[PDB]
Structures are given as C-alpha cells and as structure tokens.
C-alpha cells in the first residue's frame, strides 16, 4: 500500500548564493515509509547532467516539521494560503556550511502568480532576500 503524491517544484530561493541553477526539474515524488518517515525523489538537469536526489524526512512531534540528514537539517513543509501549494523552508547544515532554502511546491506545473507572491513574501520575511528562481518542468531527464 504505497501511499504517495506527485508535486512540482515551481520556485526556489536561498540565503547563501548558490549560482548553480537547474535548467529543468522532474516531478517530485513523495512516498510514505514505515516508521512515519517520508521520502522525496526528484531529478534536476544541470549542464546536461541528470542529478537524482532522494531525501528521507523523519516526522517530529510537531506537524509539518521534519528532520533530514540525520538531524542536522530541519525542514518545514506547510500548506500555503493559496490552493494546491505548499512552502518548504529548510534551515541547518548542508555539507559543513550553514544554509537556509525555500521551495514552492504545487500540484499544477503551470506557474500561479498568486502563489509566487505569497512565496516571495514568506522568503522576504525570513530574510531570504536573494532572487527567486522559477523552474522549468520536464517529464524526464537524460544526458
């Protein structure tokens, strides 16, 4: 009984400048695991190379709040006031240095302006002042 949901990564921003930017992204696939955990799979096209990403999120006492990379990173995935959209905010250590990231997730790949503006406001309030990058969506990635 593999409980699941398909999402699109529609926008993203961060606190530390990471000019490395995807050209395209595949659907993000969420899968429920045993022990209450939640798996996310996505592929990113950068420089004609397909990067396959899998993250396991452990659920906490608090709803919408997950830990990742063995407790070293905290991820909040909370519903947006805008329909069929969620905001992901991840603070903590990635590869040794501190970084905070935000992602807009959506059911429709077609960009929603209402959702983007909320996502902007969220980002600006947390102090993620850098440019918000909208991502293009492609069903598959190959060299």
């Amino acid at each position: 009984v593999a409980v699941s949901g398909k999402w699109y990564l529609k926008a993203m921003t961060a606190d530390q400048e990471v000019p490395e930017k995807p050209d395209s992204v595949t659907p993000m696939i969420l899968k429920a695991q045993k022990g209450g955990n939640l798996e996310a799979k996505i592929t990113m096209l950068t420089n004609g190379q397909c990067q396959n990403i899998t993250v396991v999120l452990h659920k906490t006492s608090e709803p919408g709040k997950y830990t990742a990379y063995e407790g070293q990173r905290v991820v909040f995935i909370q519903p947006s006031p805008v329909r069929d959209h969620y905001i992901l905010y991840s603070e903590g250590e990635l590869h040794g240095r501190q970084i905070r990231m935000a992602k807009l997730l959506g059911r429709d790949p077609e960009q929603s302006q209402e959702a983007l503006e909320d996502f902007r406001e969220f980002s600006r309030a947390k102090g993620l002042n850098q440019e918000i990058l909208e991502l293009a969506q492609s069903e598959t990635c190959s060299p």
Partner: antibody
Amino acid sequence: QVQLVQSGAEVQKPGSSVKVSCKASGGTFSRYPLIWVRQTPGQGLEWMGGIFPVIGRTNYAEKFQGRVTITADESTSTAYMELNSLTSEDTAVYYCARLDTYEILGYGTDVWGQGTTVTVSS
Amino acid sequence: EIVLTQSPATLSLSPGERATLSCRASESVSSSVAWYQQKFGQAPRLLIYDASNRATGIPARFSGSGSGTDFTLTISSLEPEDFAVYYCQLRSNWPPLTFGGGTKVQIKR
C-alpha cells in the same frame, strides 16, 4: 487517537434553531479542516461548510450560506453547527469530520462523528 | 461553486465482475478527490483519498485513479458487501469540499 463525539438526537419544531456539538477527544482542529456534512433521508451527502485554517476563514456551501453558523471553542475542544429557520426538509443526519489534510502527504486518517439525527416536526 | 458529477447514477453488475465508477469535476481539481462507500442506513466509510491513495485497512480491490477533471474508482472484482452507494468528494485544505450525487452499485439480474 482523535475521537469526534457529537451531541445527541434532536426533534425540532419548524421555525426553530438547532445547534449540534462536536467534542474532539484528543488532538485539536487548529490545523486540520473541521467540516459538517448532512444527509436528507434517502438522499446524498451534502457538504454544509467548515473551518479552513490554512486560509484562516470559515467557508460555507452556497446552498447553506446565511442559515448556518460553524464555530469552535479551543478551551472546550468542541465545534458547533447552528442551523436556523428549520423546515421539514432540514430533517437529516448531521456529521462533523476532521480531515487529515495538513501534511503534504499523510495516511488519510480522517475522523467522523457518530452523526446527529435532527427531525423537524411539530 | 465546483460541481462533481457522478455518472452513471446506477451500475448493475454481477458479483465478481469489475466495476468502474466515474466522478467528473467542473474545474480542475488536482489529485484532491476522495471516494466513500455507504451501505444502506449506515455511516460513510472512506476508501480512497488524494485520488489514488487507499485508506487504512481498505482491501486492494479498491483503487482510485485520475487527475484534473476525470476520476475513476475501480473495484477489481465485486464482493457481496461491495454493492452500495459510492460518493466522490473534494477533500482538501482548501474549500469547497463538495460531494458527488453518488453512484449505486446494484446486483444484476
């Protein structure tokens, strides 16, 4: 875990008001949608309205807008549906339900009350 | 508000046959449809949620599919207790959470 326990059955006279209750034993409905559904005898399920915390608003179906009021008291962990100007056609079973919709993906562990029968007749 | 249309309204199938119920939406509802069963004079019972996911303890026979406007409940092989009314409903953090008129699965003779 969470359990929804409704007020008992009610026989109401045309023109009156009925307020059904919905006590959540365990958990809160501060993040989860709390909805009210009814079913006219031998007819289909009708969504009346609910509390939608993600938009920070209580919303009603157009069919019921203005006759119905949905409230919640966090101290008593209870929610209420008050139907006004009852007619014989408001004879039905009223349900309250808390929907497991907050997480981006969950196990679908919704919770329904046992239902409250309201019979409108003098 | 959004309207969910369940057609056909009655389905007459023999026990053991496959059943295919439809629930079309007036607008695009993105994987936010649930399916309920309701046996005569009983409370509604959740089968499927988020269009495709099955609730706890729900036999494998029951499967949901679809996205956008057109959704489907499939019962791989009807058992005797599966003859009942099935409803589809918008089930989401965002209103409205309207219901379908329902489809009644009945014994063919």
